[PDB]
Subunit: 342 residues, 5 copies
């Protein structure tokens, strides 16, 4: 029979379907099964404490009032324009800060109804979600980004969200991030929100992201080591080259301070000490100690042969003492940051 | 009886409800009770003089025309689509600079009507609110952010906003700020606006925010102290190292000026003196005084043995005089800024 | 009588009111009285040549077709939803670059009708308005920001805008600006626009803003003076300290040039000379002249006792000559910029 | 007769007017006359290759179906709300990147119909238009900004756009630009687009903009000359001041390189050589040559009286040789850039 | 016959056309032919990993229900307002991140129907599309930007997208890019997406972009070479000029490090080594080696005639050894990067 007649016959004023009434108005709660497909992930900014995602959201529920038997086809696709005339759950994202649909040529929405009355709804969304981040162990850190799906208006007597037993989250093939590695394990847990207005269903997903070290090594760790070695070079210069040694010390100190200030150019103003901060503090301490060493040598050398050998002995000791202590610090730093991290 | 019939029977042309007429058209003013739930707080920018918040707003009032007795249920939830057909107050935020609703999958709105005629309306909002800030005592400052709820069109004869006796403001669990600490005490006060058009109800809430010092200590206070100590190092160098001492003085002066200029990189161009400005001024004065000291010593030393001991005595006095005066300044600074602040 | 009946009886198809026809279709022009209330002012950017304001706009006119006598109340408030069914003037802002209404919980609009037929319309607006600025006397400047209200479609035969005799402009209490002081005198003048399409009514308001000097003093004027004094210090160093004196001169010159380049970091690329530019040019000239002085002294001193006293005499003269000429320049600069400004 | 009746009598279902049918459905093409009024011009960014304009657009055409004779008035203004019910051309801007209407208090639109059937339509628009720019002769450049008006859906058999014989483009009085001078001559030319879908009418306007040099002179050209003179100063220093001369050379070289890098901070990454690039290259070459000169002098002077006079003779020759060659370069540069530009 | 009658006679309730039903509801799949015209290309940002395009999209398909014979004209243009009443495919862009239509004066849309029932639909779109980029060989790189057209709701039984046999992609005449060269060969390939909901048609286009080297040569490669030559200059200075040589070495090292840090100012934080990174590493190694050479020479020279000739011999060897090794490195670098790239 004519396709146009069946649609309004089923969902029209003649039938009596009301899209403001739940499938079972007084009865067991509606059970909604959800799965998400991630099409792109990125735009993770520490400063604005947020990340941007683009996902496909699928919802499944049973509506006994939409059961159709007469029509031959087992499964019926429909038109996106008729979504307004069916009941839909009022899902919202609790941690969302921005959202929008897509209307690129048409509404990016799908609807499918089965003979038994099952409904499949798929929609394309773009979300900016908030993610609290811990910045300790900042270079060698693992973050967790959550996404919470909640009901705004229906209590647990009416609506109950659940996860699909197989394949709740799948990621698009070939998706990669410049600064992070997305772990394949996703944690599916139950959250329930309590307010003065009642109890509301909630579901959550946790994503594990590991930062990549190559950029930080090429950028910060290696120039600091170069400045430390440059300061070490001064121990092999003649003690009579006072302007040269003093200029080298001052330049190294100022460069170290500038790099330390610039290492936090793209981070939130946190109030604790990070690993990069410990590293820069130790390197600045070494450079300053080298300058103080030459200062002591110069003070000793003008006290007039006993004073000559004593000042030379300081230079010889510092030539084999500064690299050894820095090597010990590097061993202690890199190990414990592969132990405290885990 | 059928759910669909009751809704239009109560709120339809047949009943005669008009959403443009107040619950008591000529009579005592409508009393509206409000409470807010804060779901996220952040984005506090000194430059743009504003902060961003995301809140849930609940309004309660009594409408005698909506009293229902026949239906069995004590409390009736409804559909968000029918909000257009009920009377709602015209609340607006006086200090608002931007606002938007959420339509992530549906309208984020709730409505509930009770047997007696009481209505509960809940809506999700995102607001950018303006906050005047005082920048004196800038590192050690406590700010106050206000939010004002006012009626645009109804005078006090018609509409009166009030606060709920229990729990007007609650904050979501685990909410934290990177640079601030939100105090638990909130001040509930009465504001009333007077214009040439009449008298209008207003309500206000004040939030107390205390800045955290760790970032400022790691960033500004410690490098300035390092530069001061670096300038102090010059007193232990031989007076004959004129290029070395002059280069050290010039480098310290230029670095101090650059840090002083950069300490106000992310602040509004205010016209008063902040504490950080006093600190940088004192440190620049100390560095310049050290350079002037070596200048005087060099001028004295070339006046040709009496001139030799006098110039050496200046260096010995300045070696125990510059640290003592700076220690006294640090004691006087840090105390009074823990006394004038309170 | 029933409130709902009177509204459509007055403004309905039964009555014959047409919102597309003026109050007097063929007759004397409609006279509209306007007043504005300023709720916030700020966001004055020299680069984007614009400023942002948030105002309440009130319009008053007489409509003889809306005269009501039967109803007892002298003054009738109404609902914002019915604005579409009354005639309203087509006011627009000629200098506007951006605008938006507010829909925070409802439309921020008010309407009131009186027995005689007078209408009061109040609306909340946010406007980004363009302001041509003159940058000469840039630190010590007084700007004027205009706002023009004009009719887009009606000629002077139909619509005539006027200002209210008492209180056209009032400002909200406690409004302050970080970098400017808003003067209390506002200039109310008549503007009329002439085009190839006809004559159109226009009204304008001028606001006087005076820049505050504290920020510029702390930022630019004082470090430049410090660099000049630092260059002056070189006159007291021994003439044999050639590397020290040359390094001091080069560092001062480079620092002066960098500060001069950075003094125009946040301004439009204008093609004339500002006062700050004159100041930096004079300070750079003084620093360069000091370097040229030491250059001449060093050239003279190696010409081999007559050459010894002549070179020393140059240093002694320059020690009392450079501060005196700079003091004279400061006197001439600061006076005339308190005379030419007025 | 009643004003309301005439409007729907002329343009209503009773009359049979169809706004989807052209004035002459099968017949000579519709001829549309256009003129634009420019109210503000600015926001010319080289990086984003675009400029922002705000214009009033006037369209004129004849519709024989709208001819009215009975009504007394020769010319009838109308209401903006009825624009949807008349046929309008489908003008679009081919080079447009962003556009928006204005709804500040009402739609900023005008419509007027005459007895003969002529229609005048005026609308307010804000456009961001794309402008290809040639960056050779970058300081002394003249740009051309185009704006193209085209029909999207109608071929030349149906629609033909033309320019008005008198006053197509007029500019608002007092309009000025910070960095450019708008020439008074505007070029009116005919463009026609050819696609696989057919032939479409197009019209274009070209605006000539000349850059102002004051900013570039104060910013780039003068500090480079100062650095060149500073390097020249080294020729008058004693040849025994090796650290001083070497430090001066290195500082001048590094400063020159930094200024050369910073001269292209706000420009697109083009792949050709600009005039500023030639200038900085020549100045860097002069500074390096001065350093190489002192290097050669120092190498010659330690070859041990014949070697003493030869090295002094090099300094004396370079003291009168470097300024002369730079003066010749300045003469050749500034002339040809006032000849090749024209 | 009257034009208005034919339109609703063909596509009206009287005819029975339903825009929610496919041209052949149960039958062979609908075959859609597509071609795109590119009007502007640009805004390629490595940081935000995306590019902006502005295209015209043409779709062609056959609808047997729209076959018209009676009307004389072979081809009928129509009005954009009636697009809502015809069936249209639900094309979407899978890699899209932002999109918008144009409404500059009217909807920028075209529709044309032929006698046989063929439909041509043309629409103007602006798209921000995502493009994964490989940054190895960063200066000498060739990128590929894809654009994917997919069906959101229809499976392959219903809808099948295909490319036109002649001229699928054409580019507007005179289109150029500042930093890239668009290759004339475009790759047309078949993509099909598989999901848990079914099989969906997809089509893709690949664009090849080659980066231009002029900007990178003028900006990065040449100043680094200048710094290397500047460090080479130190070999010709007297070995007794210890402050001069040490200052030259330190300044060159610090400048090299600053340029290396600044070479990645506008790129994503990738974790691999680029060619520019290899170049800066080699240049920094050469500068440091030069400083270490002078350090060794100074250490050797103070070991007290045998020590005098040995230290001089080191300087003479390094004067002909450093340029030769750097020339060999330049030969090996530039060749293999013209071989590994291809
Ligand atoms: C939604 O799922 C819930 C949870 O399984 C269902 O509630 C159970 O239903 C079974 C079957 O009738 C009862 O025997 C249990 O006692 C129920 N348990 C609870 C905790 O309620 C519910 O019936 C489902 N709703 C629908 C419409 O299928
Ligand atoms: C809204 O609250 C006000 C304030 O309590 C009520 O006004 C009072 O009402 C009581 C009870 O009728 C009177 O006895 C008082 O004289 C009123 N005081 C004032 C200052 O008005 C008002 O009745 C309430 N409105 C409604 C609809 O309940
Ligand atoms: C609007 O104001 C104008 C200006 O006062 C009025 O025009 C005058 O009206 C008076 C009273 O009828 C006449 O005597 C004058 O000759 C008019 N002068 C001019 C210059 O027109 C006008 O009547 C007012 N319109 C309305 C509707 O009140
Ligand atoms: C629009 O303008 C065109 C160009 O002038 C008109 O076309 C001409 O019309 C005259 C007068 O009938 C004819 O004699 C010419 O042969 C036409 N020339 C061409 C090239 O077509 C056209 O008639 C105008 N359309 C309207 C509706 O006035
Ligand atoms: C759309 O194109 C497909 C592919 O050519 C058509 O499918 C073929 O149709 C021919 C002609 O009837 C058959 O003989 C083939 O067996 C079909 N092949 C396949 C793989 O399906 C299809 O008919 C076209 N649809 C329309 C409406 O023209």
């Amino acid at each position: 029979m004519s396709p146009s007649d069946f649609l309004d016959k089923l969902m029209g004023r003649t039938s009596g379907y009301d899209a403001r009434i739940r499938p079972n108005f007084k009865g067991p709660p509606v059970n909604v099964t959800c799965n998400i497909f991630i099409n792109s992930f990125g735009s993770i900014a520490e400063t604005t404490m947020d990340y941007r995602v683009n996902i496909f959201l699928r919802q499944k529920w049973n509506d006994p009032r939409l059961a159709y038997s007469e029509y031959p086809d087992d499964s019926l696709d429909l038109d996106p324009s008729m979504l307004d005339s069916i009941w839909k759950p009022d899902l919202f994202f609790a941690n969302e800060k921005g959202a929008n649909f897509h209307e690129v040529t048409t509404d990016n929405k799908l609807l499918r109804i089965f003979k038994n009355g099952n409904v499949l709804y798929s929609i394309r969304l773009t979300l900016t979600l908030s993610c609290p981040m811990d910045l300790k162990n900042f270079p060698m850190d693992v973050q967790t980004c959550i996404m919470q799906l909640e009901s705004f208006g229906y209590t647990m007597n009416d609506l109950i969200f659940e996860w699909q037993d197989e394949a709740p989250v799948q990621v698009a093939e070939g998706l990669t991030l410049p600064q992070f590695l997305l772990k394949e394990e996703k944690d599916l847990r139950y959250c329930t929100k309590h307010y003065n207005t009642g109890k509301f269903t909630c579901i959550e997903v946790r994503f594990h992201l590991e930062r990549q070290m190559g950029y930080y090594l090429i950028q910060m760790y290696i120039p600091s080591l170069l400045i430390v070695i440059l300061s070490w070079v001064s121990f092999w210069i003649n003690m009579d080259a006072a302007p040269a040694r003093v200029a080298l010390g001052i330049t190294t100190v100022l460069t170290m301070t500038t790099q330390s200030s610039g290492s936090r150019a793209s981070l939130p103003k946190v109030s604790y000490v990070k690993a990069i901060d410990i590293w820069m503090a130790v390197c600045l301490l070494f450079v300053f100690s080298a300058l103080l060493e030459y200062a002591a040598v110069n003070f000793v050398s003008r006290q007039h042969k006993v004073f000559i050998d004593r000042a030379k002995k300081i230079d010889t000791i510092s030539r084999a003492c500064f690299p050894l202590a820095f090597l010990i610090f590097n061993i202690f730093y890199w190990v414990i940051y592969k132990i405290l991290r885990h």
